[PDB]
Paper text:
Panoptes is a two-gene operon, optSE, wherein OptS is predicted to synthesize a nucleotide-derived second messenger and OptE is predicted to bind that signal and drive effector-mediated defence.
In the binding site, we find that the ribose from ApCpp and the α-phosphate of an adjacently bound ligand are poised for reaction within a distance of about 4–5 Å of each other. All ligands are stably bound to their respective protomers by means of divalent cations, here modelled as magnesium ions, which coordinate the triphosphate tail of the substrate. The only observed contact that was predicted to differ in amino acid identity between the two proteins was S30 (N31 in VnOptS). For the KpOptS S30N mutant, there was a nearly complete inversion of the ratio of 2′,3′-c-di-AMP relative to 3′,2′-cGAMP produced in a reaction containing only ATP and GTP. Although more subtle, the corresponding mutant of VnOptS (N31S) produced an increased proportion of 2′,3′-c-di-AMP and a decreased proportion of 3′,2′-cGAMP, relative to the wild type. These results agree with prior studies on Cas10 and GGDEF proteins highlighting the role of serine and asparagine amino acid recognition of adenine and guanine bases, respectively.
Author numbering:
A (entry chain B): 0 to 119
B (entry chain C): -1 to 65, 67 to 119
C (entry chain D): 0 to 65, 67 to 119
D (entry chain A): 0 to 82, 84 to 119
Write the structure that this text describes.
């Protein structure tokens, strides 16, 4: 079993910027683009034998017992970024390891994938 | 004029992180689904009271109206609370004021609604 | 061999409240009291055979090769002031203690967690 | 009367990286180098007639009733960056300086914002 956790990089900053500048359009644009992006990632993971566990905000968590090419999967994730919003990912044997792996990515540059085993 | 309101869930990530660290896919997918259902009921209620939805993603909902009883709208929002998840609200004459009012509600306890003109 | 990661609960919220309300006195007190509390936490840990690895902000991270974890955290609970409490995480290395801290943060507040107990 | 709120940019990311990699050295270096940076920011604000209101964690908040050259003040803050930058907000009260700091934090950081210029 493989668990992967994906989350947008520094998304709250762009949302806070829209509020402070009183820009309904950019705030609405961001919200729509995020929802559309999380849909693409979720349907991409489904096409590669993943089971969607979580799909809300700017993150998507899925699992799978089939063989997967993380290089191809995360390559697709990076291809879904818009403006300067990237996505980080963490892989592990369970939910905890995937979450801890995601923390490692978002704390070492973001826009990257971290495999829990490679953190030890 | 146009009044704005920013609604956001209280300590939403803490329940989510707890699900990851405990390897509870049940509690995780539940929070994800119930969050999407709750924000849809919040916007639906807002549309029914003369509001225009500006943002409806993650655990928050932002809207504006040119027409409103805040105790009514906030009680409706607080009636949609599920499990240990409450909602805070911020109101102002623009997005910036509504945002700072939301920050006010989340810093002085939670499950409350603040009006920007009342913080000055 | 044993790492402990202590951190204050919801400190940024009480600081933000002082800003939005223009409460200089409360903000200064939070700064003073926070620095004194972390100092108290370190000396208490130094008295119990701990080596301080980290003492700044709203937390203290230390390790020990020798302890009364229950008594240690009980004084940590007592060091709370105003609306600010403290959580802690214990593990065999820095990663485990940190993950244990996040476990305490995500499961309430003013609680201590042991990494081997969350597995 | 002027208020200025200063806070380090993306400090927890380097602290989290230290925990997850079991690097007591990096965690110690970060904690020490930051405390030396805030005190350096504080001494610089003192020399310019500021009254320190808050000095804890990665933040430094002060006020002053004298005219100030913010460009020089902030350029000095940028000179204190190591490896880690600092953004700041200015205003006539704590609330305005805080909102100004939020503006700098969500518009690229490593910058200074004045409340009256954001409106
Ligand atoms: N000079 C400095 N030295 C050591 N740590 C510093 C520091 N400056 C900032 N830190 C960081 O300051 C932050 C303190 O607040 P945080 O713990 O992050 C959120 P909080 O509101 O205080 O409570 P929470 O952790 O329960 O959410 C820490 O993340 C710490 O990494
Ligand atoms: Mg994100
Ligand atoms: Mg997210
Ligand atoms: Mg929320
Ligand atoms: Mg939110
Ligand atoms: Mg804290
Ligand atoms: Mg802390
Ligand atoms: Mg900071
Ligand atoms: Mg800070």
């Amino acid at each position: 079993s493989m668990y992967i956790a994906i989350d947008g990089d520094d998304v709250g900053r762009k949302i806070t910027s829209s509020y402070l500048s009183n820009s309904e359009e950019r705030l609405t644009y961001i919200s729509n683009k995020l929802n559309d992006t999380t849909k693409k990632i979720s349907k991409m993971l489904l096409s590669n034998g993943f089971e969607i566990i979580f799909q809300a905000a700017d993150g998507v968590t899925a699992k799978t017992d089939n063989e997967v090419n993380l290089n191809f999967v995360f390559d697709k994730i990076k291809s879904y970024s818009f403006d300067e919003i990237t996505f980080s990912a963490g892989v592990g044997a369970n939910l905890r390891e995937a979450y801890v792996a995601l923390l490692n990515s978002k704390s070492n540059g973001k826009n990257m994938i971290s495999i829990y085993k490679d953190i030890l």
